[PDB]
Amino acid sequence: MPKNYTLQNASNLGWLFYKDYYRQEPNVDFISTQGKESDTTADFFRKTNQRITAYQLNSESPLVAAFNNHFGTPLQLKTIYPGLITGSGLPHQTGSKGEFKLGFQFDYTTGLPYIPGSSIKGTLRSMFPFSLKDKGSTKRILPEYRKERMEYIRDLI
RNA sequence: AUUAAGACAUUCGUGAGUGAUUUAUUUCCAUGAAGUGGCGU
C-alpha cells in the first residue's frame, strides 16, 4: 500500500496528483484567501504529497517486465541529482500553500512516471543539424545552427 | 375499309473495385529555499 507500487496494492500516481489532489474534505478550505494560506490547507497538501512520494519500484516489477517484453531490451540510464522533471507545463495550480505548482507526466494506465516517445525523439533530433525548420523567423540563426550541430554529429558518428 | 390491322424501346446489369487521416513537431523557456538577527550597553 504505502510503498512498492505493484499492481495489486497501489493508488494511480497520476490520479493522486491530478484528480484526487484537490478533493474537498471537511474543515479544509482553499477557496478563500484565508483558507489558501492556512496551516490546515498546508497540512492537507503535505499529507497528499507524502502519499505521492512514498512509492518505490522493484527491479522485478511485472509492469516493467511487461514493458521489456513488449518493447524489447531497454537502455538503462540512471538519474543524477538535480532531479528529473517531465511535463512541467501541465496546469496544476490553485494558489494554495504546500501544493505542487508545476505539472508532472504520468502514464494514464499504469500511473508510473514516464517520458513520452515524442519528448525523446525531439530531444535526440535537437542535436542534429536539420532539426530547425527553414522559416522566416529562423533564417537568421539557421546557418550557425546547422554548422555547429553538423560537427557534433560528425564526431559522434 | 382508307399502301390497312396487331406490336411498351424492351431483357439481362450492385457506383463498384484498390486506399491507415497519415507524415513532421521536446510541455518547453526565465527564475538563488532564500532574507534578517534581537536584548542583557
Side-chain angles (χ1 to χ4, degrees):
Chain A
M1 191 31 253
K3 316 233 194 321
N4 231 297
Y5 197 51
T6 70
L7 270 153
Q8 300 97 41
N9 210 327
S11 298
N12 206 286
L13 284 171
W15 186 80
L16 297 174
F17 184 77
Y18 283 122
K19 277 199 133 280
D20 195 76
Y21 204 73
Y22 299 108
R23 71 209 168 281
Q24 300 298 147
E25 282 216 335
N27 261 358
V28 158
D29 177 28
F30 44 89
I31 308 183
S32 44
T33 303
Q34 264 93 312
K36 289 193 240 246
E37 267 142 32
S38 42
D39 315 86
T40 65
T41 327
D43 295 354
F44 170 78
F45 284 123
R46 179 145 65 41
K47 271 134 71 191
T48 319
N49 299 338
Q50 276 187 17
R51 263 153 65 51
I52 277 279
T53 54
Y55 281 107
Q56 339 170 339
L57 207 48
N58 212 248
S59 325
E60 274 91 28
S61 202
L63 290 155
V64 156
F67 290 148
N68 297 351
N69 285 340
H70 301 328
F71 305 138
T73 283
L75 175 69
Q76 320 199 261
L77 299 173
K78 162 177 29 145
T79 54
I80 78 171
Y81 162 85
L84 198 155
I85 332 171
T86 36
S88 54
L90 285 164
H92 184 276
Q93 186 192 160
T94 58
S96 323
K97 196 204 239 197
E99 63 151 353
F100 284 136
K101 309 290 183 173
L102 312 185
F104 206 82
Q105 198 83 245
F106 288 105
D107 194 56
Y108 183 91
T109 304
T110 64
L112 296 167
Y114 81 134
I115 325 167
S118 33
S119 289
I120 318 171
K121 177 162 190 213
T123 280
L124 296 172
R125 183 155 202 212
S126 76
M127 278 294 131
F128 272 85
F130 292 82
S131 65
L132 190 63
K133 195 138 201 138
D134 210 1
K135 244 164 43 164
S137 48
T138 50
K139 257 165 160 118
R140 196 216 339 134
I141 60 180
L142 193 289
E144 293 93 8
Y145 190 91
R146 310 196 161 153
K147 187 183 141 45
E148 298 169 349
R149 262 147 188 91
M150 198 106 63
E151 315 245 29
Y152 175 80
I153 284 308
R154 182 164 285 120
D155 323 289
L156 227 64
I157 289 176

